[PDB]
Amino acid sequence: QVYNITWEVTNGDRETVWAISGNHPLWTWWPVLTPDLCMLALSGPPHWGLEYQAPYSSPPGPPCCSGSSGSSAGCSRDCDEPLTSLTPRCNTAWNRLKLDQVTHKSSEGFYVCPGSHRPREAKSCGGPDSFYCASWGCETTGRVYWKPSSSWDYITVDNNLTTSQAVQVCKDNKWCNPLAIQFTNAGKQVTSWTTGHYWGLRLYVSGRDPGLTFGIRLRYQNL
Amino acid sequence: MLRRKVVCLNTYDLVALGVGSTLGAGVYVLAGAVARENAGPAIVISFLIAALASVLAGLCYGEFGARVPKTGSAYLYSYVTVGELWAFITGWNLILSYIIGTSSVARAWSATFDELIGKPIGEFSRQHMALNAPGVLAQTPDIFAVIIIIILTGLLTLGVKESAMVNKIFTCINVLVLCFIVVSGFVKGSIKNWQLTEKNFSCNNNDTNVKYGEGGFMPFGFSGVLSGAATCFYAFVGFDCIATTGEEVKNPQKAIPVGIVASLLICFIAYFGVSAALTLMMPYFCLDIDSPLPGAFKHQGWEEAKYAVAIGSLCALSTSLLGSMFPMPRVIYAMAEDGLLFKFLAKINNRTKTPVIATVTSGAIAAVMAFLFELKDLVDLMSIGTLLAYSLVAACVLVLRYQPEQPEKFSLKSILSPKNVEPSKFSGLIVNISAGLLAALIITVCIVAVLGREALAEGTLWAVFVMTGSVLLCMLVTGIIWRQPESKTKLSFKVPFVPVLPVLSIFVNIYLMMQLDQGTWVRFAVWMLIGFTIYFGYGIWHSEEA
Ligand SMILES: *[C@@H]1O[C@H](CO[C@@H]2O[C@@H](C)[C@@H](O)[C@@H](O)[C@@H]2O)[C@@H](O[C@@H]2O[C@H](CO)[C@@H](O[C@@H]3O[C@H](CO)[C@@H](O)[C@H](O[C@H]4O[C@H](CO)[C@@H](O)[C@H](O)[C@@H]4O)[C@@H]3O)[C@H](O)[C@H]2NC(C)=O)[C@H](O)[C@H]1NC(C)=O
Ligand SMILES: CC(C)CCC[C@@H](C)[C@H]1CC[C@H]2[C@@H]3CC=C4C[C@@H](OC(=O)CCC(=O)O)CC[C@]4(C)[C@H]3CC[C@]12C
Ligand SMILES: CC(C)CCC[C@@H](C)[C@H]1CC[C@H]2[C@@H]3CC=C4C[C@@H](OC(=O)CCC(=O)O)CC[C@]4(C)[C@H]3CC[C@]12C
Ligand SMILES: *[C@@H]1O[C@H](CO)[C@@H](O[C@@H]2O[C@H](CO)[C@@H](O)[C@H](O)[C@H]2NC(C)=O)[C@H](O)[C@H]1NC(C)=O
Ligand SMILES: *[C@@H]1O[C@H](CO)[C@@H](O[C@@H]2O[C@H](CO)[C@@H](O)[C@H](O)[C@H]2NC(C)=O)[C@H](O)[C@H]1NC(C)=O
Ligand SMILES: N[C@@H](CCCC[NH3+])C(=O)O
C-alpha cells in the first residue's frame, strides 16, 4: 500500500541532516538524494569545521562582499581572492569555494567507500576511523580520475551542481556543495534501507585525504 | 667592463647606528600591514626568515669589507675586488635602496604625523589633488612627504651632518617605546587572538572587504608567511650604515661585522616582540589600516597610549629617515667621482664643501617617488633592489674566496679533483663559471618554485623534472666549488661556510625577490634599464680608469 515515505541522509553520528519525502508505495520511489557535502559534516570530524554545528544549522561564516546581498559590515573579500591557500572545508563561504574547487577538479575530487553492507573482502579496507577505506581500491563511487564503480554498491555519488553554478551559491553564503546520490539497481533491490546503510566519503587531495562518514536510511508512515 | 681599482666609534656606537637606522617604518607601520594582508599572527615567523636572510647577507659583508683596507659601501668593495660593471650594478642598486628608503620612510612618517593631528593634511590632499591612477600610482599624493624631503635635503646641502648624540637619544626613546609595546601586548593581549575561527570573523566596526583567511596562527598559509617575510626584509635594511659612514672605527673590520650582527639580532627581537604584541592585542584582520599599533592600543582600552607610540614612532621614523638620506648622495658622488655616473654629480660646492648637485638630485628623485607611489610600492621596490645588492655581494664573496691573488679550455680531472694546494687562474675560472651556472640554476629553481608552485603541487612531469634536475645540478655545482682550493690569504673575518652559506644567501634572496608582485618587478626592470643605459652610454667611456 501507499505510505508517506521519507529518505533521510544522516551524518556520521546517524543524526538526520537532510531528508526528502513523498507519498509512494514502499520500495517503488528512489529519488536522487541531494544532500550537501557540508550537511554530512555537521557534527562531523574536526577538519570540516562543523564538529559543533547541529544538523539543519545555517551555513556559518560572514557573507561574501560579492554576494547577491552586496557589501555589508564585516563582509569578506576572501571569496574573490585566490583559493589556492585555503583548506577545503565548510566553516566559511570561501572555504566552501575551495571545497567545491577540490571536489570538481579532475586531478582531485572525492571517493566514497562502502561500509557495513560491503562484503567480507572489502571488510579488509578498514573501519569508520579510516572512513571505511584505509587502502586504495576500496571506493565504489565518487568523482575522481579513475571513476570507480561497483555492481553491488547500493548508491553512486557525484557532484550535483557544476563549479559555475556552485560559485554563485557559495558567494551568497548558502550551502553550495550539493552531492547527487543515486540509488543503484543493486541498491533498489535491497530492502534493508529501513535499518540504514553507511558510507565514508574522502576528498582526494595531497595529504591525509580528509573524509567523513554519512548514511542513508528510509522511514515510512501511514498515508 | 671588468676594470678593477687600486685602493673612534666603538662597537656599541656601530650597534646604536645600525639599530637606529634599521628600526623605524618596518615595525611601526609595515608590521600591521603585513599582519593584516600577507600573514596573520604568523608574521612573527615572517620576520624570523627575513631576519635570517638579513643575517646571511650581513655575514658576507664582514668578509666583503675585510678584503678592502678602506671601509665604505658595497660599491667601493665591488669596484676594488670584482670589476667595473658589477660595481656599477651594486652602486645603482644601493642608490635605488637609499632613494626609495628615503621616499618610503618619508611616507610613513608623514602619514604618522598626519594621523596624529587628525589627518587634516591627507584630507586636504584628497580634496585638492588626486592622481586618479589607483592601479599604478598612489590614490593620495603625499605632499607633506615632499615638503619633508625638501627640508631635509636643504639641511643636508647646507652642511648638516650626523649627530650621533641625537641618534643615540632617539634610539633609546624608540627602544623604550618598543619595550613598552611588548609589555603592554603581553599584559593586555591574549593567545585567543591567535586561535580565531569563523565565529570571530567579524570586526565590530563598519569596515568591508575584510580578508579573514583561515583564521588561527597562519590564516593565509605559508605562502602568505613567505610574502610577509619578503615584505619584512624591508624592516631589516639599514644595517649597512655602519660601513657606509666611513668614520674612523676603533677596530673597523672586526667591530663592523659584530655590530651588524648585533644590530640585526636586536632588531629581530624587537620586531618579534612588537608583532606578537600587535597580533595578540587585536585581531589581525581588525588591525587599523592607517595606524595599526595605536589602533590596537585603542581596541584594548589604552587609548592614551597612542601618544606614547606617536612619540616613539616619530622618533624612530626620524632616525631611520636620515639613515637613508645621509648615505644617499655619497654613493652617487662616489659613482660620479669614479666616472661611472655623470661628472656634474661629483662637483663639490666651495661654500658648503658638500656634493650639492648630487644631494639635490637624489632628494628631488626621492621626493618625486614619494609624491607618486604608495608606501607598500616603495617598500617593495627598495626590497627588490636591496635583495639584488645583497645577492650580488654574496656572489662576490663566494667567487673571491677562490680567486688567486690578482696583480676556455679545461680538463675534467682538473675540474672534479684538483690537486693544487692554492688557487690558480684555472681554479678561479672554474669557480667563476660555477658561480654563474649556480646563479642561473637558482633563478630557475625560484621561478619554478613560485610560478610553477601549483604545477609542482599538481605533480606535472615537466615541473617536477625541472625542479629535481635544477636542485641536483645546484648541489653538483656547489660541490665542484667545494673541491676547488680556497685562497690562503688571511682575512680578519670569514664566512663560516663560504661554499654553502653564500649560496644559501643567494637562494633565499632570489626566492624573496620572486615573492614580490609584478609591479615591483616592472619598476625594478625599468630602473635597471636606465642604469644600464647610463653605464653603456656614459659609464664605460668616461670611467676614470680608462
Ligand atoms: C510525511 O512525512 C514527512 C516526514 O515525517 C517526519 O519524519 C518522520 C521520521 C516522523 O518523525 C514524522 O513524525 C515526521 O513528521 C513530513 O515532513 C515533516 O513534517 C514535519 C511537520 O509535520 C516537519 O517538522 C518541523 O516543524 C517545525 C515547526 O514545528 C519546522 O520549524 C520545521 O522546519 C524546519 O526544519 C525542517 C527539518 O525538520 C527543515 O527541512 C525546514 O527547512 C526548517 O528548517 C519542520 O517543518 C518536518 O521537518 C518535516 N520533515 C521531516 C524530514 O521530518 C510530512 O509532513 C509528511 N506528510 C504527510 C502528508 O503526512
Ligand atoms: C645564519 C645561519 C647560522 C643559518 C642559516 C639558515 C638559513 C639558510 C635557512 C633558515 C630558514 C630557511 C628558510 C625556511 C623556509 C623556506 C621556504 C621554502 O619554500 C617553501 O617551503 C615553499 C612552500 C609553499 O610552496 O608553500 C624555501 C626555502 C626557505 C626560504 C628557507 C631557506 C633557507 C633558510 C633561510
Ligand atoms: C611649517 C613646517 C616646517 C612644519 C613641518 C614640521 C617640521 C617642524 C618638521 C618636518 C621635518 C622635521 C625633521 C625631520 C627629521 C629630523 C631628524 C632628527 O634627527 C635625527 O633623526 C638624528 C639621527 C641621525 O642623525 O641619524 C632631528 C629632527 C628633524 C631635523 C626634524 C625636525 C622637525 C621637522 C623640520
Ligand atoms: C541539483 O541538481 C538538480 C538537477 O539539475 C537541480 O534541479 C534543477 O533545478 C533548477 C532550478 O531549481 C530547475 O530549473 C531544473 O529544472 C532542475 N532540474 C531537475 C532535473 O529537476 C537542483 O537545483 C540541484 N541542486 C539541488 C540542491 O538539488
Ligand atoms: C570567538 O568566539 C567564541 C564563540 O563566540 C568565543 O568563545 C566564547 O566566548 C565567550 C565570551 O563572550 C565565553 O563566555 C564562552 O565560554 C566561549 N566559548 C567557547 C567555546 O570558547 C571566543 O572567546 C571568541 N574569541 C575572541 C578572541 O573573541
Ligand atoms: N629598515 C628601515 C627602512 C630602510 C632603511 C632606512 N634607514 C626601517 O625599517 O625603518
For residue B408, being part of any structural domain is answered with no
Nearest Cα to A75, choosing from A94, A59, A56, A62? A62
Output the nine-digit C-alpha cell for B139. 590614490
- Experimentally, the structure was elucidated by cryo-EM
Q: Chain A partners of B457 at a C-beta cutoff of 8 Å?
A: 206
Q: How many of the other CB atoms lie within 10 Å of CB of B176?
A: 14
Rounded Cα distance, B6 and B216, in Å:
57
CA B525 to chain centre: 17
Ligand nearest to the CA of B52: 2
For residue B452, being part of any structural domain is answered with no
Q: Are B32 and B292 in contact (CB under 8 A)?
A: yes
Q: What is the CATH number of the domain that holds B301?
A: 1.20.1740.10
Q: Is ligand 6 within 6 A of the CB of residue B385? A: no
Q: Chain A partners of B458 at a C-beta cutoff of 8 Å?
A: 107
Residues B428-432: contacts with CB under 8 Å, at least 24 apart:
B428/B402, B428/B403, B428/B404, B430/B480, B430/B484, B431/B398, B431/B399, B431/B402, B431/B403, B431/B481, B431/B484, B432/B399, B432/B403
Nearest Cα to B93, choosing from B526, B385, B510? B385
CA dihedral over B182, B183, B188, B190, signed as positive or negative: positive
A60 touches chain B (CB under 8 A): yes
- The protein residue whose alpha carbon is closest to atom 14 in ligand 2 is B49
Q: Where are the alpha helices (H) located in B422-517, listed in sequence order?
A: 425-450, 453-458, 461-483, 501-515
Residues with Cβ < 8 Å from A193, sequence gap 6 or more? A187, A216, A217, A218
Rounded Cα distance, B546 and B544, in Å:
5
Residues with Cβ < 8 Å from B341, sequence gap 6 or more? B332, B335, B534, B538, B539
Chain A CA closest to residue B38 = A85
Question: Which residue is listed with cell 566559511?
Answer: A92
Nearest Cα to B449, choosing from B433, B470, B430? B470
Q: Are A155 and A187 in contact (CB under 8 A)?
A: yes
Rounded Cα distance, B18 and B16, in Å:
5
Q: How many CA atoms lie within 13 A of A26 on its CB side?
A: 13
- Structural domain range at position A45: 2-222
Q: Does the distance separating the beta carbons of A62 and B202 come in below 8 Å?
A: yes
Cβ pairs bridging A and B (under 8 Å): 60
For residue B421, being part of any structural domain is answered with no
Q: Where are the alpha helices (H) located in B216-355, listed in sequence order?
A: 221-232, 241-245, 252-281, 292-299, 305-325, 327-337
Give the phi and the psi of residue B379 in degrees, each rounded to 5. -60, -45
Helix, strand, coil percent values for chain A (each to nearest 5): 20, 25, 55
As a whole number of Å, the CA-based R_g of chain A is 18
Output the nine-digit C-alpha cell for A21. 519525502
Is A78 annotated to bind a ligand? Reply is yes
- Structural domain range at position B222: 11-197+215-393
Counting every residue written for chain A, the total comes to 223
For residue B475, being part of any structural domain is answered with no
Q: What is the CATH number of the domain that holds A164?
A: 3.90.310.10
Counting every residue written for chain B, the total comes to 546
**The total number of structural domains that make up chain B:** 1
Beta-strand runs (E) in chain A: 2-10, 16-25, 109-114, 155-159, 179-183, 197-204, 211-222
Nearest Cα to B439, choosing from B481, B411, B403? B481
Nearest Cα to B332, choosing from B147, B522, B146, B534? B534
Give the phi and the psi of residue A199 in degrees, each rounded to 5. -135, 165
**The total number of structural domains that make up chain A:** 1
Output the nine-digit C-alpha cell for B375. 608606501
Q: Are A210 and A90 in contact (CB under 8 A)?
A: no
Give the phi and the psi of residue A158 in degrees, each rounded to 5. -150, 175
For Cα atoms A210, A214, A215, give the angle at the middle one, nearest 5 degrees: 160
Nearest Cα to B107, choosing from B133, B146, B155, B135? B146
Whole-number Å distance, alpha carbon B418 to ligand 2 midpoint, is 32
Helix (H, G, I), strand (E, B) or coil at B204: coil
For residue B351, being part of any structural domain is answered with yes
CA dihedral over B442, B445, B447, B453, signed as positive or negative: negative
Cα-based distances in Å from B499 to B338, B402, B509: 32, 10, 16
Q: Which residues pair with A25 in a beta bridge?
A: A2
Helix, strand, coil percent values for chain B (each to nearest 5): 70, 0, 30
- The CA-based diameter of chain A, rounded to the nearest angstrom, is 55
Give the phi and the psi of residue B39 in degrees, each rounded to 5. -125, 155
Give the phi and the psi of residue A204 in degrees, each rounded to 5. -95, 90
Output the nine-digit C-alpha cell for A152. 553491488
For residue B49, being part of any structural domain is answered with yes
Cα-based distances in Å from B265 to B65, B86, B116, B504: 20, 29, 30, 19
Nearest Cα to B215, choosing from B224, B206, B207? B224
- What torsion do the CA atoms of B279, B283, B289, B291 make, to the nearest 10 degrees? -50
Buried-state track B393-406, b at ≥16 Cβ within 10 A, e below 16: bbbbbbbbbbbeee
For residue B420, being part of any structural domain is answered with no
Nearest Cα to A40, choosing from A126, A157, A154? A157
Rounded Cα distance, B145 and A128, in Å:
64
- The protein residue whose alpha carbon is closest to atom 3 in ligand 4 is A160
Whole-number Å distance, alpha carbon B218 to ligand 3 midpoint, is 39
Rounded Cα distance, B67 and B498, in Å:
14
Residues with Cβ < 8 Å from A24, sequence gap 6 or more? A2, A3, A5
Rounded Cα distance, B217 and B284, in Å:
10
Output the nine-digit C-alpha cell for B446. 625560484
Output the nine-digit C-alpha cell for B194. 591567535
Residue B363 host element (H or E): helix B356-372
Q: Are B390 and B112 in contact (CB under 8 A)?
A: no
Output the nine-digit C-alpha cell for A162. 557544476
As a three-state string, the secondary structure of B490-504 is CCCCCCCCCCCHHHH
Q: Does the distance separating the beta carbons of B213 and A84 come in below 8 Å?
A: no
Rounded Cα distance, B305 and B297, in Å:
6
For residue B98, being part of any structural domain is answered with yes
Q: Taking each helix axis as running N to C, give the angle between helix B501-515 and helix B221-232, from 0 to 180 degrees, rounded to the nearest 10.
A: 100
Nearest Cα to B216, choosing from A49, A182, A155? A49
Q: Are A103 and A159 in contact (CB under 8 A)?
A: yes
Breaks (C-N over 2.5 A) in chain B follow: 7, 407
The resolution in Å comes to 3.0
Q: Are B474 and B445 in contact (CB under 8 A)?
A: yes
Q: Are B389 and B90 in contact (CB under 8 A)?
A: yes
Q: Are A49 and B212 in contact (CB under 8 A)?
A: no
Q: How many CA atoms lie within 13 A of B165 on its CB side?
A: 0
Rounded Cα distance, A214 and B482, in Å:
59
Q: Are B232 and B19 in contact (CB under 8 A)?
A: no
Q: Are B194 and B280 in contact (CB under 8 A)?
A: yes
Question: Which residue is listed with cell 557540508?
Answer: A38
Give the phi and the psi of residue B358 in degrees, each rounded to 5. -65, -45
Helix (H, G, I), strand (E, B) or coil at A191: coil
Rounded Cα distance, A151 and A186, in Å:
7
Rounded Cα distance, B289 and B293, in Å:
10
Q: Chain A partners of B210 at a C-beta cutoff of 8 Å?
A: 62, 74-77
**B452 burial via Cβ count (<10 Å: 0-12, 13-18, 19+):** middle
